[PDB]
């Protein structure tokens, strides 16, 4: 099944979209829900196209409707963090990803970006690069994977991974649209592939210099949601969408530094892996918003330089928390149940 | 459900629309129904494109069919008031919002613009600015909200406010089309967002210098109706569309003056609020066509200058009456059950 | 029946596709499945458009999901072999057909290209030209031929071969789209025709200089699968799609050399046919991935120069194996159950 | 949605059923699946109607298909335990509920009846009476509750508990059919009611003298499954069918003895409750097949004699284990993690 | 999908069926098709109800339409062999299973009954008893199993063997109707069960004294076809209905003699098994119309008397050939590629 809005005549929408916009420019503010994994958005009008993120004014929203404020002082604030081109509106309109504050102007329970940015600024000399692969499932509005038979299973696993064909890959139009929208918007998307079960896909984001990783992955998730809403399907990042033998279906984070990219970086990668081996429980706790767990590429080992792979994060993981934990455990040499405060 | 006209082949319509129009120009006269909240329209042909509103001739219509005239002398008059570009016809065609007169050439029961314009002209030195947020619900032709399940509720409140996704926001194509149409037509639309229940949305109009507020909000309502008619859905401004816990779902009016925008304007805002506190019943009567009721932004209080917010008007309110009452109570210092006549 | 993805609004997809892509370029790596007849693909991002195939980097994939690797070392490699323009993405994006390696960097069980390329390089002086005609059937997602009646047969054979009409040819849009996509991508497609039963078609690829034959036929098969996926139908190369009197429905390979194209080449063609007559069982074994069998054109015989036709290969045949066997039996004069190793 | 078998013409079935059966009699053997909560059945033919359970011969089945045997010796045995009239076949045909044995003629992992019967025979002097209330949900074949809107919720809780009306109770025909079938078959069903959410129902079984409780509840579950299969819906005893605020949705067991039914039995009930208070974890473990947790009726307290209520068992509980645990903790005064063996 | 005839109003049919028939009686002659596995039938009128099979006259049919005669002399003959009550017509009407002859009055290629009857008459002193279990699949008219999802699989194997529930057993109404029809008609049906995949079932016929086995199994197959035709589904005895892991899905024949039923019959069973072990290829050839292959029940071994089981015959096997081969190999001690002629 598909949503009722997807059955509206989209040619009418495209007739209205093709009107010359004028001097005004629409900016769609995007922020993370109070649940830690949802995204909320609302569009305002700017008198002119902003050249930089600093020209974007701050905004506010009702936090009581977003699961992240109390009744007495419900208003929260939106401080713009990253700016991207609007694929849906095709320019000069801008997507504005923003942080959330409380009435006290202090980071919200779900604003993990504020600290993550501080951590990345501390280790800015090492220039960390992250690459994150996000796996999702396309679902109908009836709660079942898109293109699956009603009350039924498509078939045994094996033909669908990177498959091509009407019976091999489901909803590739969503994937192509999302890829093109992320390219236009400036997201650092590096590729896509179809996963082992049909209607399950994956897009990779990276390499990114820092908080760019979290910003790009969150905006890529938003673009996926908007594109799927246009098509009338649902993008699910739940680690266990369909019950069965398949277990993980989660994000993989690739971490490198300046030293690891240069010669004799394999020993730095080994040191980082050994440091991570001690903090397994902390990373398992941090990755959840509520063969090998950590793996090394063999091509990197042959070249003795490169990156590593962490298979532990789930699909609904928060990139800010993941990257901050990876930096703290490896670069900052932190140990303990709770992170230290670099006040 | 959607209307039968929405299932006509719209590509045929766009083939006919793309014909070179020629020297003639079509103007769609729009006026307020006798009910006080409905809109009526009819298009004529002009030999040339009018540069200003004064070139638009007066027109007439059958008031017996519009609930606002008696049988003996049914004819009413249309005097053009505001001119906008026609989004639907894409230029040089014009939307003409007009006032209604009786056979006596005297303002109609529903023409509240004529007095409101006089009031705004009296206080033109203070330069009042209004901002109005209009909340509407998208409904099917079956009387239920669009995208809702038949005989059913979408789910608990909370995921839908400013939500993105096929299961989070219903009928966003209508919203995008209406936003672009209002931009092209010259309406001062400042942004939109999705409301707490799905298929419920809101657009903000403002700031506006005067009767511009009423003109822009009425033409924005007309554009919403035309766009929804193109999509085959209904835009409802009823304050209580769906029975349940949700109560208000009504317009919010933001009022500022020249003094309140300048430094030390917070005391002027406080004076206006104190004046409004006495005339609560009068404003409640005037807003109906048939936490705090009046609120102050906290950012304005921190900056000690700006505007205030009135949460009392409903969604089907008449902007002319609302703005006239706000001016009379605050700027004109009027008191009493009935307004004074500045003859 | 058609796939559920085909019922998505494709106008939305085309709106997203028309976005200006930017400096980045998407390359879709394509490789042969472990089954020997399936195709797998996945797209990456390149910083610039590659001018030649050598600029394409090597890649890797999970061979456990592709029926061609064991659990311990599942990773396989993709070495680019041929580059074509991407019809689906309309440039500068590129389709990259690649060979598969094991973790040992040794040809995979299904990588028959590596040896075939060696064989063609050995006989490069003779300049062999191959022409292959591929016959396929368009099927619904319900496992029946496209356009056929449910639980029914279209009619007696005879009106459908090269037929024109709604009741004569089924799914010609797929054929036209595939032909245009192969032209744009640079495939050497020489023509198409409709076969004796409806929804069955055939496209010819050739002439090709060498491994170009295998590359072009495999990429043409991939383009057919992608186009059919866009239309929501399935392209089947099974030699026996629908049970009945029809038997072969398989590929025909046309083989010529430099000598056979020149004058008095008919005797060379006769020598090649006599050599092939001895190795019938070997070619029957090699053609399977798991009137006359070999025929001569009469126009060639009248002109005493040209090519021959082999009707023995099936529709799901591997072009690399077919062309390698044809070269080895004719040009290399090989005899025996197993081919010799030119180490 | 409903199953495809439910859309077969049932009048044809009733025409065939009305044929005079003859001298032969069909007996449907029923046994518990290896999963501990599923039911399996298969019908044989008897030359004459059995007057007692002892005339029923033993049978066998393939335990490899029932998740309860290994490959080498898959055969299991069926020893008849209880006999009931066949509601579906309307007599002289009999439903035969049987225990399962292994090839060693030793109770199967899921045959908890064999021990429970021993325990009840030990305490046969006290004459324990049990009453069990079973709560189930009617679901479509699409995995959603029957009569619920697609992708939707019926409404707020409150109108549906014991409700009457097309919008208040869903699938009452299943309930009436199941009640009448259980009456005819001899099940001690004491009543039904509709639960707080629509399509959720409950039937009470009791009072029963002993292993009669387990036999009657299991056969009532089987009759519910057969009736729902006739109607094309699914009866689910999962404690959490639909995600949401509702939590328990589980069976309630009412336990009395001969002493508790007589005068001054309230002190015996208090002693039993105090004994149960110590073994909470053991009963929680035993109830799972993989206000107050224990409550006392107030009418019993006013009359100072009667029974108690245990709210702890879930809906998918095994009655044999529940009743055996209740007897062992109260009557047998057992304490400890594992039960004692009365060998 | 179901056949179009199943969607006719069956109440009309039952109104016509309930008419008092009168003195005339309808007899439906049934014979085996020329293909060896199909059944053909046609009904005549008798002036009175026949008390015995000998009162049934011989008939004839067009063998050119039945794949078992040449053009010059197409007529074949029907000699009545067995008489049963007509379940479909509810008495006094009779089903007449008949042998087929050629114009020469000599057994037809597919009339294997004539010889089988001779063989059984030779060994009539030993009184052989056979029991045959027939496994079939219910299919829609679209060629897929009944109740399966379109283009889909129901689920993993394991819940369906002897399952009860709308999601566990498909088309049980067909099974109940067929069981009751076979009981009424006098078929020696001993029971049914649901098989490992849904819509697959099995009925057992036996014990039978001789050619009674072939007669009863063929008439049971005919009754299954007629009942399924009434329901609009297809009964398939193909050994491999749905491609996949499941392989056999074929009939099991249980063979006993007078000696094997008496004490110390286990040695006779062992002798029969040893004789069968030599003639495996002959029985494999004879069973086809175009753990252990032969197994012994363990209960029989414990009681040292009873029967054996042959798992080798397929589902579409001819019972006459199977029983004749079992008698010839065991009782007649025959050896060789071709059977001896007891002329
Ligand atoms: Mn990975
Ligand atoms: Mn407000
Ligand atoms: Mn040919
Ligand atoms: Mn209770
Ligand atoms: Mn068997």
Q: Sign of torsion, CA C156 C158 C164 C169? A: positive
Which residue in chain E is spatially nearest to C148 when comparing CA positions? E142
Q: CA distances (Å), B113 to each of A223, B27, B104, B282, C199, in order? A: 44, 21, 17, 18, 67
The tokens describing A163, both together, are 């498959």
Task: Provide the 10 A C-beta neighbour count for residue C85.
Answer: 18
Report chain E residues whose CB lies below 8 A from the CB of D43: 179, 191-193
Q: Which residues contact E312 (CB under 8 A, 6 or more apart)?
A: E250, E280, E283, E284, E287, E293, E294
Tell me the residue length of chain C.
Answer: 343
Distance between CA atoms of residues A65 and C101, nearest Å: 54
Give dist(CA B260, CA B175) in Å, integer.
33
Rounded CA separation E315/E224 (Å): 14
Give the tokens for residue E209: 């004294």
How many whole angstroms separate alpha carbon B222 and alpha carbon E17?
67
What does each C-alpha distance from C95 to C44, C219, E199 come to in angstroms?
Answer: 10, 9, 45
For C171-266, where are the E strands, in sequence order? 189-194, 200-208, 234-236, 252-256
3-state secondary structure of D268: helix
Which of D1, D150, A148 is CA-nearest to residue C4?
A: A148
Contacts of C67 (CB under 8 A, 6+ apart): A158, C33, C34, C35
Q: At what angle do helices E113-122 and E211-231 cross, to 10 degrees?
A: 140
Alpha-helix runs per DSSP H in chain D: 10-17, 113-122, 172-185, 211-231, 258-261, 266-278, 280-287, 298-303, 319-330
Question: CB–CB of D128/D119 below 8 Å?
Answer: no
* Cα D307 to ligand 4 centroid, rounded to whole Å: 12
Chains D–E, number of C-beta pairs less than 8 Å apart: 132
**Interface contact flag, B174 A8, Cβ < 8 Å:** yes
CA distance D67 to B217: 69
Question: CA nearest C104: which of B306, A302, D45, B166?
Answer: A302
* Residues followed by a gap in chain A, C→N > 2.5 Å: 290
User: Measured in angstroms, how far is the CA atom of residue D294 from the centroid of ligand 4?
Assistant: 10
Angle between helix axes D113-122 and D319-330 (nearest 10 degrees) is 30
Closest CA to C244 of C156, C160, C316, C170: C156
Rounded to an integer, what is the distance from CA D331 to the centroid of its chain?
Answer: 23
Contact E114, E99 (CB under 8 A): yes
Among residues D314, D316, D145, the alpha carbon closest in space to that of D243 is found at D145
Q: Are A27 and A36 in contact (CB under 8 A)?
A: no
Instruction: Give the residues across from D27 on adjacent strands.
Output: D44, D94
Any alpha helices (H) in C205-307, and if so which ranges?
211-231, 258-261, 266-278, 280-287, 298-303
Which is nearest to C77 in space by CA: D25, A93, A124, A302?
A302
User: What is the signed CA dihedral for E58, E61, E66, E71, rounded to 10 degrees?
Assistant: 120
D334 Cα to chain E: minimum distance (Å)? 37
Gap positions in chain C, given as the residue before each gap (C–N > 2.5 A)?
A: 290
DSSP 8-state class, residue B153: B
- Residues whose beta carbons lie less than 5 angstroms from ion ligand 1: A 252
- Return the closest-CA partner of residue E95 out of E41, E38, E32: E41
Q: Across-strand partners of C77? A: C60, C101
User: First CA to last CA across chain D, in angstroms?
Assistant: 52
Q: Subunits with at least 3 CB pairs below 8 A relative to chain E?
A: A, C, D
Cβ contacts of E1 on chain C, cutoff 8 Å: 150-151
Please state whether beta strands A94-101 and A25-32 pair in parallel, antiparallel, or not at all (unpaired): parallel
Which residues have a Cβ under 8 Å from the Cβ of D152 and sit 6 or more positions away?
B148, B149, B152, B153, B154, B155
Chains that touch D (3 or more CB pairs under 8 A): A, B, E
Q: Give DSSP secondary structure letters for D101-168.
A: E-TTS-B-TT--HHHHHHHHHHTTTT--EEEEEEEEEEE-TTSSBTTPPTTSB---SSS-TT--STTT
Q: Report the run of H or E that residue A226 belongs to, with start and end.
A: helix A211-231
For residues E166 and D141, the answer to whether their CB atoms sit within 8 Å is yes
Q: Which residues share a beta bridge with E255? A: E130, E308
CB of A109 closer than 8 Å to CB of A92: no
Q: How far lies B315's CA from each of B145, B236, B322, in Å?
A: 16, 9, 12
CB D308 within 8 A of CB D273: yes
Other Cβ atoms within 10 Å of B65 Cβ, number: 11
User: Does A3 count as an annotated binding residue?
Assistant: no
Q: What is the resolution of this structure in A?
A: 2.6
Verify D-C touch: 3 or more CB pairs within 8 A.
no
Maximum CA extent, chain A:
60
Q: Which two tokens stand for residue D206?
A: 């009791």
CA distance A140 to B25: 46
Residue of D1, D3, D139, D142 for testing the chain A interface, max A β-carbons within 10 Å = D142
B130 is in an annotated binding site: no
- Residue E309 Cα to ligand 5 midpoint, Å, equals 7
Cβ neighbours, 10 Å, residue D123: 16
B-contacting chains (≥3 CB pairs under 8 Å):
A, D
Cα separation, C271 vs A147, whole angstroms: 54
Residues of C in contact with A146 (CB under 8 A): 4-5
Give the closest residue to B330 by CA, choosing from B307, B302, B314, B303: B307
CB-closest option in E150, E153, E167 to A153 = E153
Q: Evaluate whether D54 touches D41 at the Cβ level (below 8 Å).
A: no
Q: Specify whether the CB–CB gap between E82 and E32 falls below 8 A.
A: no
Facing E141 at nearest CB: one of C1, C143, C151: C151
* Closest alpha carbon to E317 in E36, E34, E30: E36
C50 annotated to a ligand binding site? no
Query: Of the ligands numbered here, which is closest to the C-alpha atom of D310?
Result: 4
Cα separation, C259 vs C269, in Å, equals: 9
Q: What's the token pair of residue E107?
A: 């057994």
Q: Give B235's strand partners.
A: B138
Apex C43 CA angle, C42 and C48, nearest 5: 155
CA atoms of E257 and E268, how far apart (whole Å) = 9
| Residue D55 per-residue DSSP state | G
Beta carbons of D3 and E169 less than 8 Å apart: no
CA C271 to chain centre: 28
**SS3 of residue E271 by DSSP:** helix
Residue C36 marked in a binding site:
no
**Token code pair at residue D292:** 């107050």
Q: Which helix (H) or strand (E) holds C332?
A: none
Chain A residue numbers touching B176 (CB-CB < 8 A):
13, 16-17, 88-89
CB C206 within 8 A of CB C215: no
Strand C94-101 relative to strand A252-256, pairing: unpaired
Task: Report the residue of chain C nearest A207, measured CA to CA.
Answer: C45
Residues with CB under 5 Å of ion ligand 3 are C 252
Tell me how many degrees the CA angle A280-A283-A286 measures, rounded to the nearest 5: 150
The Cα–Cα gap between D32 and D42 comes to 12
Residues preceding discontinuities in chain B at C–N > 2.5 Å?
290
Q: Strand, coil or helix: what is D193? A: strand
Among all bound ligands, the one having the nearest atom to the CA of E291 is 5
Method: cryo-EM
CA proximity to C37, closest of C206, C225, C171, C179: C225
* Spatial distance between the Cα atoms of D282 and D301, rounded to a whole number of angstroms: 27
Chain B residues contacting D, CB < 8 Å?
Answer: 148-155, 167
Per the CB < 8 Å rule, is B153 touching D151? Answer: no
Say if the Cβ atoms of E179 and D41 lie within 8 Å.
Answer: no
Helix (H) or strand (E) holding B49: none
SS3 assignment, position B151:
coil
State how far residue D142 is from chain A, nearest Cα, in angstroms: 5
């Amino acid at each position: 099944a598909t949503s009722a809005s997807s059955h509206l005549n989209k040619g009418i929408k495209q007739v209205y979209m093709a009107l010359p916009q004028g001097d005004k420019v629409q900016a769609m503010y995007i922020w993370i829900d109070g649940t830690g994994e949802g995204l909320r958005c609302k569009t305002r009008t700017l008198d002119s196209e902003p050249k930089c993120i600093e020209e974007l004014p701050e905004w506010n929203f009702d936090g009581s409707s977003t699961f992240q404020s109390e009744g007495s002082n419900s208003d929260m604030y939106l401080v713009p963090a990253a700016m991207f081109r609007d694929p849906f509106r095709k320019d000069p309109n801008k997507l504005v990803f923003c942080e959330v504050f409380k009435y006290n102007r202090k980071p919200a329970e779900t604003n993990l970006r504020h600290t993550c940015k501080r951590i990345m600024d501390m280790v800015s000399n090492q220039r960390p690069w992250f690459g994150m692969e996000q796996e999702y499932t396309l679902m109908g509005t009836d709660g079942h994977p898109f293109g699956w038979p009603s009350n039924g299973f498509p078939g045994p696993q094996g033909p669908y991974y990177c498959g091509v064909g009407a019976d091999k890959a489901y909803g590739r139009d969503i994937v192509e649209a999302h890829y093109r929208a992320c390219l236009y918007a400036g997201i650092k998307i590096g590729g896509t592939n179809a996963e082992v079960m049909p209607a399950q896909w994956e897009f990779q984001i990276g390499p990114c210099e820092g908080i760019d990783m979290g910003d790009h992955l969150w905006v890529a998730r938003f673009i996926l949601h908007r594109v799927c809403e246009d098509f009338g399907v649902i993008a699910t990042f739940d680690p266990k969408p369909i019950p069965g033998n398949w277990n993980g279906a989660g994000c993989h984070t690739n971490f490198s530094t300046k030293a690891m990219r240069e010669e004799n970086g394999l020993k730095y990668i080994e040191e980082a892996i050994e440091k991570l081996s001690k903090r397994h429980q902390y990373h398992i706790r941090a990755y959840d918003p509520k063969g090998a767990s950590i793996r090394i590429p063999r091509t990197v080992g042959q070249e003795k330089k490169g990156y590593f792979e962490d298979r532990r994060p789930s699909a609904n993981c928060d990139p800010f928390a993941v990257t901050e934990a990876l930096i703290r455990t490896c670069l900052l040499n932190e140990t303990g149940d709770e992170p230290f405060q670099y006040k």
